[PDB]
Amino acid sequence: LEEAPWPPPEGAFVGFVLSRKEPMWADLLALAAARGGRVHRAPEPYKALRDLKEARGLLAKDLSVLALREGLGLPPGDDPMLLAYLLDPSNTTPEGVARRYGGEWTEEAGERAALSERLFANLWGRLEGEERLLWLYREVERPLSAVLAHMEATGVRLDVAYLRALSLEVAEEIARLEAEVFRLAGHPFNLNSRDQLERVLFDELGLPAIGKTEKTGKRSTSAAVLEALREAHPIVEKILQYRELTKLKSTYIDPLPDLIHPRTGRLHTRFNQTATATGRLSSSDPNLQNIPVRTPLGQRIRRAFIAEEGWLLVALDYSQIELRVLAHLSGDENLIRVFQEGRDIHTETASWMFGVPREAVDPLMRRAAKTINFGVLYGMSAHRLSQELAIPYEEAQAFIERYFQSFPKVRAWIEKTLEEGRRRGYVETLFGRRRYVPDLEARVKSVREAAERMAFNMPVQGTAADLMKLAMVKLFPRLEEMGARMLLQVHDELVLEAPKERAEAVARLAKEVMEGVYPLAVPLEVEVGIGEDWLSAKE
DNA sequence: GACCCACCGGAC
DNA sequence: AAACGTCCGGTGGGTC
């Protein structure tokens, strides 16, 4: 490209280099723009940001986030990564997209700007005629990038002193459990090393090996194996407790307080828009979509996510979302009637699992039933189900039979989806988002059947993702006009932050927007709560 | 110091 | 572990 002086003309493609991948923490090392066969390189990147009207190019959202961090309203526009991701969601990184559609991802701003230009032209042309993918781009993914940039730059408040105190308490309990393990083993070793633990459990203590690991064939020490051995030796129960506490301390309690940003005083995740095979978002650096919630200690961690003073958190979460989606996609009359009658299949599975009235189901029980319902739906074996429910093999196989007998149109939909996936090579969501699954025709059965479970999961999970994304796009301008913030997305859940005096109005409105995002053959119901902390808002 | 591999486990 | 799916991250073990 011919070099031309900064600034670039309006509408040019942007290229940029960060000192590190996280835009909230990155130094902007270089900034360039390309257009009309010309490349423009900025003498001072920070100053030159003020010249741009929007971020148009590869990884546009990251540049927009850094602009917001600097107090600049620079919205993200076109991003050929989003085009590539709609054509094939295995298009997840710039390195791969470049090597597929006509360029090379380097470390220089100007080359990245020129690459963004050539890649947009090529990919936009590949979408000519793909009307449904173009609708998803214009109506969901491109506007969604702007919502996500604002969420990333806003962040979430964390009770740091709380988590600091909690680390010290959890350490004390870890030390006691460790001493108990070493004593029950008769000697110390590195309880964090699964190799050392394997030798101690299965060679020294002679416990029976339940299963083996995939690539190296070691005797597994997974929670499931230990669950199976929970009564075969008292040490197992203690190892299960040690694993729980060390997992939560090392992954959440200790690292999260060290990620507070100095200028915002808040914690900033990244919402990756081209990272999953189904159209879900992902979250990283840190992942705020897998914050603990299940166990009592997990709940204490979740309580550390709090509202700014004078604000409240609002948490909203679709009810039984993939089951409602399945009802719509399959057309099963029986499953539809379940939701038109206000029934709860997680509660009903819970009542059967634990043999208690629906009134007696607690959150820990409902979660367990949740895993059963989706485990069975997406192809869990009677063998594993027998082990999860702790019932005879026969009684687990009888549950899988009843489950699908209740909704006969579902297996019919599974087979039509797989058959169409074999013919077309891809499966698709309600909105036409595609996932290519060529192993539906694999000649090795185990491989093929794994591909089948991925293939008919995708329309259900991806439709639910499409609906959530569309709701975010519709809800975001309403929130800005009410003075409220969108903070987090957790797949079928939003966490908002609102002025105390407006929290109730925001909760009501967000619930309506979410439930009415796109009418299906069943109603979408959204559970909403308000609190000073993430856990209390979910109650 | 950066990176990889395998496994293990958090959430939805 | 096992014929649930989708992700990301810590640890040990290892290399360069």
Ligand SMILES: Nc1nc2c(ncn2[C@H]2C[C@H](O)[C@@H](COP(=O)(O)NP(=O)(O)OP(=O)(O)O)O2)c(=O)[nH]1
């Ligand atoms: N395959 C699979 N999908 C899962 C699993 N857990 C969650 N999902 C998928 C399927 C779920 O529909 C979706 C959202 O998860 P939630 O909000 O935690 N549960 P839901 O919406 O069903 O029930 P309610 O909100 O009334 O508590 O994530 C699982 O173990 N397996």
Ligand SMILES: [Mn+2]
């Ligand atoms: Mn839900």
Ligand SMILES: [Mn+2]
């Ligand atoms: Mn949820």
